[PDB]
C-alpha cells in the first residue's frame, strides 16, 4: 500500500494530491497531471495510456523533481515544460512521449526504456544516465546529449546529424546509420566492433 | 665478383643474364643496358663521395634482381622492369617515373614487381602504374607519388610518415602493420583497403574518438 490499484479515468489530478508518495499497479486513463506537484513521487506498474481513446496523461508544467517511474505505460505522455531534474524513469513504454521545453537541470535517469517516436527537441540532457533505451524514430533536433551514457542503445531509424552527441558513451549499441564523415564525434566512447562497422561504411575492411 | 668501376659506360649485353657480388659501381651509365636475368648482391652503386648515382634510364629490367643493393640516386627513368626484384636495398631518392611494370599477355594488362623491405625515402614514383604487386615493408618517407596507383598491392609493413595519401591510389590495398602518418580516413579514398585493429583505433582518436576495449 498504501496506493494500490487506482483506476482513475478523466480526472484532474490536485495539486498536492499525490506529492512524495508511492502509487503501484494503478491506470490513469486521460488524466490531467498538470501542474501537478509530483516531488518524490513514485509510479510502479503503473499505465497511463489508453489503447481505447489512444490518449496518454498529460504532465506539462508538473513538477517532477526526483520523481521516479517504473515499469510504467506513459505511452503518448505529455512531458512538456516540466521540471525534471533528478527524475527516474525506469523499464518504461513511454513510445511517443514528449518532453520538449521539460528542464532536467543536468540529472536524469531514463533507462531500459522505450523511447521510440519520443520528442526530445531542443532538450539538454548532459551528462546524464540514458543507457539501454529503444530510440527508434525519436526526434532530437536541437537536443544535446553531451557526455551522457548512451551505452546499450537502438538507433535504427535515429538521425544522428540532428544534435549533440560530443563525449558521449555509444558503446554496445546498434548504432544504425551512423556516418563518421558528417557527424562530430569528438569525446566519444566506442568499442571496437563499431569502429570496424563505422570504418566498413567507407568501404575499409578491418582485420 | 668484387668489380670496382667507376665512370664507364656499360656495353648493352655486358653483364646480360649474369650474377654479380660484392661490386662498386660509381657514376657508371647503364643506360639502355640489357640486365633481364642479371642478379646484383651486395652491389654498391652510389658514390658517397661524389655524392652521385648510376644511371638505369630506358634499361631493359625485366626480370632484374637487386639484393642488399645500394641504389641511392639511381635513376630508373622509363626503364622496362617487368617482374623486377628489390629486395633489403637502399633506394633513397631513386627515380622511377616512366619506369613499366607491365605488359599485356594473352587470356589483359599484368603488373608485377618484387620491392620489399627497402629504403624507398625520396624515391619518385609520380604517375607510376604498380597495381597487384609486392611492395611491403618499405619506408617511404617524402616519396613522391603524385598520379601514382598501387591498387591492389601490398604495402604492409610500410613506413608512411611525411607521405601525401592523396597524391596516388591506394584502394584495394593492403596497408596493414604500416605507419601510417597524417592518414586520414575522412579525407582519402579507402575502398578496398585492409587496416589493423591497431591502425583502426588510431585513425579513429584523429576523429576524437576513443575504441575500447
Redesign the interface.
Known amino acids: 500500500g498504501s496506493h494500490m490499484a487506482l483506476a482513475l479515468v478523466g480526472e484532474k489530478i490536485d495539486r498536492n494530491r499525490f506529492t512524495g508518495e508511492k502509487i503501484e499497479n494503478s491506470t490513469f486513463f486521460n488524466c490531467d497531471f498538470s501542474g501537478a506537484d509530483l516531488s518524490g513521487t513514485e509510479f510502479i506498474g503503473c499505465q497511463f495510456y489508453d489503447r481505447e481513446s489512444q490518449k496518454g496523461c498529460n504532465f506539462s508544467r508538473a513538477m517532477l523533481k526526483d520523481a521516479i517511474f517504473k515499469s510504467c505505460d506513459l505511452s503518448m505522455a505529455d512531458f512538456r515544460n516540466s521540471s525534471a531534474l533528478g527524475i527516474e524513469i525506469r523499464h518504461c513504454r513511454a513510445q511517443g512521449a514528449d518532453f520538449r521545453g521539460a528542464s532536467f537541470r543536468c540529472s536524469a535517469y531514463i533507462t531500459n526504456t522505450n523511447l521510440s517516436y519520443a520528442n526530445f527537441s531542443k532538450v539538454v540532457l548532459e551528462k546524464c544516465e540514458l543507457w539501454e533505451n529503444r530510440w527508434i524514430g525519436a526526434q532530437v533536433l536541437g537536443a544535446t546529449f553531451s557526455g551522457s551514457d548512451l551505452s546499450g542503445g537502438e538507433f535504427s531509424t535515429f538521425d544522428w546529424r540532428a544534435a549533440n552527441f560530443t563525449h558521449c558513451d555509444l ?1 554496445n549499441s546498434e548504432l544504425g546509420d551512423l556516418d ?2 558528417g557527424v562530430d ?8 566492433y ?3 562497422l563505422l ?1 566498413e561504411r ?6
Not at 564525434?185 to 571496437?192: A, Y
Not at 567507407?202 to 582485420?207: D, E, Q, R, W, Y
Request: glycine letters at 10%; hydrophobic letters at 50%.
Open positions: 558503446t563518421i564523415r564525434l569528438q569525446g566519444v566512447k566506442l568499442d571496437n563499431q569502429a570496424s570504418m567507407l568501404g575499409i575492411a578491418v582485420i
